[PDB]
């Protein structure tokens, strides 16, 4: 099932890397945000997202995949009423690929039937691995976007721009994607001095209407270990090589 410390070398080598910014939105690494509408199925959109990114990097093809199929057929995940990321990736391999999002479109909380035969050629993974709670920035820069868990509040929903570090949550309650890291030098309005504010860049599952054209940023530090709102305690990324 592979581990970080080995697979890292396959790509990292070991240059050490600018911990300030790398953003997959800009190197053919980020597929478009989608809207899970009413239905608690982020676990599905997060996982399907992370693979969509691996395909667009490691084999440079654009694909939208049926997160619906996943809800209907992933049995170690409890449909629209929740699920876990690894469980998805496990069920993913068992199914041996998922249908194009066109042959098998998404329909939110509408009851639908698992139907493997609905499409012709399918798109699989080969394995998945877990990321340690620290080497995040190292992972992203070299491996790609990640699927991760997080704790959320109602303050959270109303986000619309800039750095957020507001109210978190009691325990992890939503699954989404890491897509990079960055930094804007912003001037402390009181001391009025060059302060470097580091942020993680994120993709959600609530439409382009929400946040920054669908995304949202969160403060952190240069090392990348400020994991605000229990960031990435569960954290896996899919591989196809
Ligand atoms: C990575 C995990 C922690 C995320 C998750 N949180 C949720 O809110 C899910 O309903 C998915 C969602 O989109 O909201 C979740 O599924 N939590 C519970 C996991 C246990 C299985 N879920 C059941 N039995 N409802």
From Swiss-Prot:
It is found in: Vacuole; Membrane. The active site is at residues 42, 174, 204. Disruption phenotype: In early trophozoites, the food vacuole is swollen with the accumulation of undigested host hemoglobin; however, in the subsequent stages the parasite recovers, and parasite development proceeds normally. Induces expression of FP2B/falcipain-2b and FP3/falcipain-3 in trophozoites. Disulfide bonds join 39-80, 73-114, 99-119, 168-229. A motif (Arm motif) lies at residues 185-194. A motif (Nose motif) lies at residues 1-17. It comes from the Eukaryota. Auto-cleaved to remove the propeptide. Component of the hemozoin formation complex (HFC) composed of falcipains FP2A and/or FP2B, plasmepsins PMII, PMIII/HAP and PMIV, heme detoxifying protein HDP and falcilysin FLN. The HFC complex is involved in hemoglobin degradation and detoxification of heme in the food vacuole during the asexual blood stage. Belongs to the peptidase C1 family. Cysteine protease which cleaves native host hemoglobin and globin in the food vacuole during the asexual blood stage. The binding to host hemoglobin is pH-sensitive and only occurs at acidic pH. Cleaves ankyrin and protein 4.1, two components of host erythrocyte membrane cytoskeleton required for the stability of the erythrocyte membrane, and thus may be involved in parasite release. Preferentially cleaves substrates which have an arginine or lysine at the P1 position and a leucine or phenylalanine at the P2 position. The propeptide is not required for the folding or final catalytic activity of the active enzyme. This is Falcipain-2a. It comes from Plasmodium falciparum (isolate 3D7). The gene is FP2A. The chain holds residues 244 to 484 of 484 of the full protein.
């Amino acid at each position: 099932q592979m581990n970080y410390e080995e697979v890292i070398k396959k790509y990292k080598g070991n240059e050490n890397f600018d911990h300030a910014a790398y953003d997959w939105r800009l190197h053919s690494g980020v597929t478009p945000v989608k809207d899970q509408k009413n239905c608690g199925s982020c676990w599905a959109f997060s996982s399907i997202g992370s693979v969509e990114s691996q395909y667009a990097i490691r084999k440079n093809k654009l694909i939208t995949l049926s997160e619906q199929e996943l809800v209907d057929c992933s049995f170690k995940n409890y449909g629209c009423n929740g699920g876990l990321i690894n469980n998805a990736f496990e069920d993913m391999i068992e199914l041996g690929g998922i249908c194009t999002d066109d042959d098998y479109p998404y329909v939110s909380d509408a009851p639908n039937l698992c139907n493997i035969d609905r499409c012709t050629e399918k798109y699989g993974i080969k394995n998945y691995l877990s990321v340690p709670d620290n080497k995040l920035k190292e992972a992203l820069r070299f491996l790609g976007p990640i699927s991760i868990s997080v704790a959320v509040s109602d303050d959270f929903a109303f986000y619309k721009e800039g750095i957020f570090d507001g109210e978190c949550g009691d325990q992890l309650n939503h699954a989404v994607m890491l897509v990079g890291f960055g930094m804007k030098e912003i001037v402390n309005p009181l001391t009025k001095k060059g302060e470097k504010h580091y942020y993680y860049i994120i993709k959600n599952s609530w439409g382009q209407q929400w946040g920054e054209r669908g995304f949202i940023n969160i403060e952190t530090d240069e090392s990348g270990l400020m994991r605000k709102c229990g960031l990435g305690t569960d954290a896996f990324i899919p591989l196809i090589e």
